[PDB]
Amino acid sequence: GEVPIGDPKELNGMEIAAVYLQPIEMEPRGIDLAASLADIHLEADIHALKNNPNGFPEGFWMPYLTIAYELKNTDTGAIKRGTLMPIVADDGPHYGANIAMEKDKKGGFGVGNYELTFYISNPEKQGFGRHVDEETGVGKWFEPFKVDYKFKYTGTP
Amino acid sequence: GGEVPIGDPKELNGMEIAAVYLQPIEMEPRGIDLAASLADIHLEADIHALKNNPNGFPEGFWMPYLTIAYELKNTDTGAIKRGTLMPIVADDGPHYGANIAMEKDKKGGFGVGNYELTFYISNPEKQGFGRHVDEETGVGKWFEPFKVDYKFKYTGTPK
Ligand SMILES: [Cu+2]
Ligand SMILES: [Cu+2]
């Protein structure tokens, strides 16, 4: 059962939603933390809005973007930063990562009201290009921006 | 038109693979790909998810993080040149393409003539792209590396 975090934000021609489920077994194995040692699979859902500035058709998934997350507990004041890898499930491509909450050895990441950030950079760092000719070129990529959600952690769904 | 179709599309491994080549295209960041002034065409590969894609990609979606290598052989001059097609976005959506020197190649043999185009396609796992493999949200294995063939006549930069 997937649980929404806050509600989506529409900026830079993209709909940015936050969701998390139970830890998810992943392949290739070894890159992302093992589902056995995690408490959640935090997924970032980012799709091009209608009339996207950068030529991405409406509803398409936005690939090659660099997503760094920050996980703050308002009650705990404990925060850790990590990365969200590009992943695909049976419902479509997305960005995700398994994170250990209750199992965070240093604690403070179990129970709590939470603040979730997404630090989003454009695909150019990953070698992704774009046309800039007058006939088929598209606009500039957004500059790095941040997105913040508020959610209260319920344990594993 | 400004855009030339190459052969006919292929429907394999849950994807539609089509090829088209353009005039040389100016693209940023500059330096990654051969500059448009030094090229004669812009070869592009259009790859999208078919209906009921075995790897969880919605119908019509662009297939990202793919490793696409191309081989262009002038059947009449026997010349062969290889390269890779980068992920890039135009005004009509993302694709894989590259600026290629044909008549402008110094080794010669890539002028007008009959051509055999081949794409060498490997799955996204080499880029670190992930897969759900749980019972509820899991998707099937990725295809093994394969290739598709096109044939077309080249008579210079599209017009
Ligand atoms: Cu996921
Ligand atoms: Cu292109």
Side-chain angles (χ1 to χ4, degrees), chain A residues 1-72 74-80 82-105 107-157, chain B residues 1-29 31-159:
Chain A
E2 56 201 2
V3 57
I5 288 166
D7 272 43
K9 301 129 181 41
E10 318 198 356
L11 300 166
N12 294 329
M14 313 180 283
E15 174 173 52
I16 312 190
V19 195
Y20 74 74
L21 311 92
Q22 39 170 342
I24 299 268
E25 294 89 77
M26 259 203 63
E27 285 299 300
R29 166 258 191 90
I31 295 149
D32 194 17
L33 182 93
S36 323
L37 292 85
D39 291 294
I40 46 170
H41 179 60
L42 172 57
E43 295 192 339
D45 291 300
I46 315 173
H47 292 246
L49 321 164
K50 195 164 84 185
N51 189 39
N52 172 263
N54 304 102
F56 269 84
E58 185 188 9
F60 261 29
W61 179 63
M62 299 299 293
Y64 295 94
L65 287 169
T66 300
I67 299 279
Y69 79 85
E70 199 172 305
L71 212 47
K72 180 189 232 195
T74 64
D75 313 302
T76 321
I79 307 89
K80 182 62 208 164
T83 313
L84 309 188
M85 311 335 298
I87 301 157
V88 65
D90 58 2
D91 55 357
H94 63 274
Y95 302 87
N98 287 330
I99 305 174
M101 301 276 76
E102 299 122 4
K103 302 158 208 227
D104 183 279
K105 64 271 172 192
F109 285 110
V111 266
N113 278 270
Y114 269 108
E115 261 167 359
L116 172 57
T117 315
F118 286 156
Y119 296 111
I120 315 197
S121 275
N122 64 34
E124 283 183 313
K125 287 265 199 184
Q126 297 196 13
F128 186 87
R130 57 165 180 123
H131 294 200
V132 290
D133 63 306
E134 182 77 21
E135 318 92 67
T136 74
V138 313
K140 220 166 273 271
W141 281 113
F142 55 85
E143 293 216 7
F145 69 119
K146 93 192 203 104
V147 152
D148 275 309
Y149 300 84
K150 297 279 259 205
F151 86 100
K152 302 182 331 273
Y153 181 36
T154 54
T156 301
Chain B
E3 301 216 30
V4 187
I6 293 164
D8 286 276
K10 280 97 211 183
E11 303 191 26
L12 306 146
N13 297 279
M15 320 154 104
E16 185 187 36
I17 311 93
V20 298
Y21 71 98
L22 278 84
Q23 68 282 3
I25 298 276
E26 206 193 325
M27 39 200 60
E28 312 295 70
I32 291 184
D33 195 24
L34 172 69
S37 39
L38 287 143
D40 291 283
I41 54 166
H42 181 61
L43 175 59
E44 301 190 315
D46 289 300
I47 311 174
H48 295 91
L50 288 161
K51 179 189 292 299
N52 183 32
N53 177 264
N55 305 116
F57 267 84
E59 187 188 348
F61 260 37
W62 179 61
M63 309 303 294
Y65 295 91
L66 293 184
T67 307
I68 314 282
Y70 72 83
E71 210 167 55
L72 204 49
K73 171 195 210 173
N74 185 323
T75 37
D76 302 305
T77 71
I80 304 176
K81 59 150 77 200
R82 309 136 190 91
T84 68
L85 302 174
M86 320 153 39
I88 54 190
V89 64
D91 63 335
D92 58 356
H95 65 273
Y96 302 98
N99 284 342
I100 306 184
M102 299 283 275
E103 297 98 331
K104 296 180 194 194
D105 199 313
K106 265 44 164 284
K107 322 301 157 201
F110 304 101
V112 315
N114 290 266
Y115 278 81
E116 281 171 348
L117 175 69
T118 297
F119 294 148
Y120 299 97
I121 307 155
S122 93
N123 69 45
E125 277 169 347
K126 330 307 150 196
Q127 317 289 18
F129 194 83
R131 257 192 327 131
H132 283 204
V133 293
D134 57 304
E135 247 288 297
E136 185 78 301
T137 68
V139 299
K141 301 161 166 175
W142 280 113
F143 54 84
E144 283 170 24
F146 66 105
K147 78 188 168 274
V148 285
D149 282 300
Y150 309 72
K151 263 143 63 142
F152 73 99
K153 293 156 177 282
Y154 174 65
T155 59
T157 310
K159 41 188 135 178

